[PDB]
Amino acid sequence: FHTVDVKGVQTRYFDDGQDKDPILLIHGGHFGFFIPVGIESWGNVLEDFGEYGRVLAVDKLGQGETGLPLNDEDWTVDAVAEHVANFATQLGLKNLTLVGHSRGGMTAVLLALKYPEMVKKLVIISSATAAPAPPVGTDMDFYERVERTAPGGSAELIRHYHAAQAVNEGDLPEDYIGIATKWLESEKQLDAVAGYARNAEEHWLPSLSEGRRWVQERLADAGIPVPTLVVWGVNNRSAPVSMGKGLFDLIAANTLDSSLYLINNAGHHVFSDQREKFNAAVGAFISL
Amino acid sequence: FHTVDVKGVQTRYFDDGQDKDPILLIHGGHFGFFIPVGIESWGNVLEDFGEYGRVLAVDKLGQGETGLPLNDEDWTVDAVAEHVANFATQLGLKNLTLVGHSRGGMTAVLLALKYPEMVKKLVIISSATAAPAPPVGTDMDFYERVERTAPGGSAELIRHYHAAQAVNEGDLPEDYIGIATKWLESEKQLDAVAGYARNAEEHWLPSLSEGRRWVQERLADAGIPVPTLVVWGVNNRSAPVSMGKGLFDLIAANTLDSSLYLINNAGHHVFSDQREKFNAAVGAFISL
Ligand SMILES: */O=C(\[O])C1=[C][C]=[C][C]=C1C([O])=O
Ligand SMILES: */O=C(\[O])C1=[C][C]=[C][C]=C1C([O])=O
Numbered sequence: 212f213h214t215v216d217v218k219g220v221q222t223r224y225f226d227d228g229q230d231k232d233p234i235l236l237i238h239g240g241h242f243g244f245f246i247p248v249g250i251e252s253w254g255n256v257l258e259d260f261g262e263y264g265r266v267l268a269v270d271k272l273g274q275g276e277t278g279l280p281l282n283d284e285d286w287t288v289d290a291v292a293e294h295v296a297n298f299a300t301q302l303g304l305k306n307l308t309l310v311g312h313s314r315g316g317m318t319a320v321l322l323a324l325k326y327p328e329m330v331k332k333l334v335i336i337s338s339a340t341a342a343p344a345p346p347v348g349t350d351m352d353f354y355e356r357v358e359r360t361a362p363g364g365s366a367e368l369i370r371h372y373h374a375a376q377a378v379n380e381g382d383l384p385e386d387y388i389g390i391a392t393k394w395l396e397s398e399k400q401l402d403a404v405a406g407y408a409r410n411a412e413e414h415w416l417p418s419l420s421e422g423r424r425w426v427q428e429r430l431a432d433a434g435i436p437v438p439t440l441v442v443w444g445v446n447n448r449s450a451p452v453s454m455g456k457g458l459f460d461l462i463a464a465n466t467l468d469s470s471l472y473l474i475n476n477a478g479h480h481v482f483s484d485q486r487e488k489f490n491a492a493v494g495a496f497i498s499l
Numbered sequence: 500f501h502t503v504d505v506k507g508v509q510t511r512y513f514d515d516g517q518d519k520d521p522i523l524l525i526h527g528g529h530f531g532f533f534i535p536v537g538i539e540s541w542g543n544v545l546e547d548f549g550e551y552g553r554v555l556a557v558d559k560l561g562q563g564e565t566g567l568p569l570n571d572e573d574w575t576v577d578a579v580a581e582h583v584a585n586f587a588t589q590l591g592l593k594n595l596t597l598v599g600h601s602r603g604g605m606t607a608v609l610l611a612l613k614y615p616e617m618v619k620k621l622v623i624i625s626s627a628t629a630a631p632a633p634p635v636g637t638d639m640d641f642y643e644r645v646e647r648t649a650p651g652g653s654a655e656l657i658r659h660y661h662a663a664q665a666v667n668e669g670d671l672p673e674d675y676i677g678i679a680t681k682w683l684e685s686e687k688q689l690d691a692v693a694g695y696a697r698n699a700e701e702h703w704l705p706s707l708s709e710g711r712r713w714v715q716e717r718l719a720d721a722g723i724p725v726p727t728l729v730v731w732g733v734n735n736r737s738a739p740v741s742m743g744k745g746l747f748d749l750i751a752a753n754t755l756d757s758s759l760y761l762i763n764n765a766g767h768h769v770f771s772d773q774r775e776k777f778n779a780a781v782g783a784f785i786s787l
Contacts, residue, residue, distance in 0.1 A: 445751050470762050470780075471760070473758060476755040487787050492783055495779040
């Protein structure tokens, strides 16, 4: 692990130190999310992607051990993406491969769209955020449901969420439960929830909708400027496969160098649920 | 190459001879098909899958350089599958990975269903045959049209068909053209087409419908007993991606260990159209 200052924000990141083309991992979730998500959430892939390249994972704005956004105006999708981009510029990353999950996928997409010179490959995993908004309800309804039904307890909450989305499940690693718990009791987490509740309607959600609209625009125009791989779990409970397929149709419309991989007996956490196939497929995509 | 006798049928096959897990390639087409399909149709894949295992390719019944079925009763999908099974048994293939394309895909399924002891992994590529029958028309309508509009000439026919199906391909290799021309003009081809016209309605087509109904039954029952990969080209013209997806949905119902890979800018011959991606993905899948 390491810590650095990115445009006035204290950012924690992970670096493989290998001398290969870099792979940047952008995790899911957003600031103030009822579940803490961090570098450790990548779990085994941090080691597993060692063969395919120099692995880097970064804590997003206002998540993990990274600082909250400097201003309320920065509670936007674009601020997050720009934070990751500035982080990459700071580390002199080139020939980059972006692997994003959930909300991170959205981040990754934007970067690919906004900075093709830096990015060579893009991987989107189970990202309802990058995809068009659901026809009814919100992308948060599943999560609101899971939060409201959660039993008291910090670890109990995390296990509750894992039970909510795991399909090919086993108990979470104890270390991760400990770290995620530590994140959960943290004052920054409280501040994150407060910031979300404060800035969701004014800043975050509009940036989300406008972001989806922009991504859809680019997909209908020239598509993504880099080779794209979409990974999804057939049994994903938060985000249905249908929107994953639809997102693939939108990408495939004008992005010739693109592919879709659907894994059965997997949920939102495909890399966790079906680790070996995920590594085999995504790894195959990265090493070509 | 080599020739061996499989239940009284002269059978041509290719074996790289490596001491690795076997990969059996079953090519497309059926006996009497207006285009000859053989081991050579696999082209680069024959060398390319050398990395992933011991490659074997076999000419199907009444196809390539193998003899026509001995009896009119043997013009069935099950007879073809039985020929391939018998062939694999004679050479002592175990831990087999079945990779079937188009009609071969159907064969690949049957064996997987019928001989789990022999088969360890399954790959289906662009198989309208394995998929359910079309809601309107037949799986041959596309081909009947391609046949009827073809200009005179053997090479002219083969390039006509290639133009009909190619998406990211360039003019065919001359090496393949000579072989395909010789196959087309050969007396055996004439005998195969005549035999097809003779046995299509009574034996072959009922065997096809019954095969589809049976496969669907097994898929809805216990599914396939081996890890399965379904590969498809998004721009497939003979067999639309929708029916491919439908087939994957049918498989995924009870086959936990299954995946679907959709490749953009590829058609029926995915392995030709997107060679590097295809080799990467399928090769990664075969090696786990
Ligand atoms: O985990 C996520 O990335 C996420 C959070 C909230 C809504 C949707 C999503 C998603 O993209 O799966
Ligand atoms: O690929 C084939 O061999 C084929 C030929 C004729 C109709 C359908 C198919 C198929 O399964 O795609």
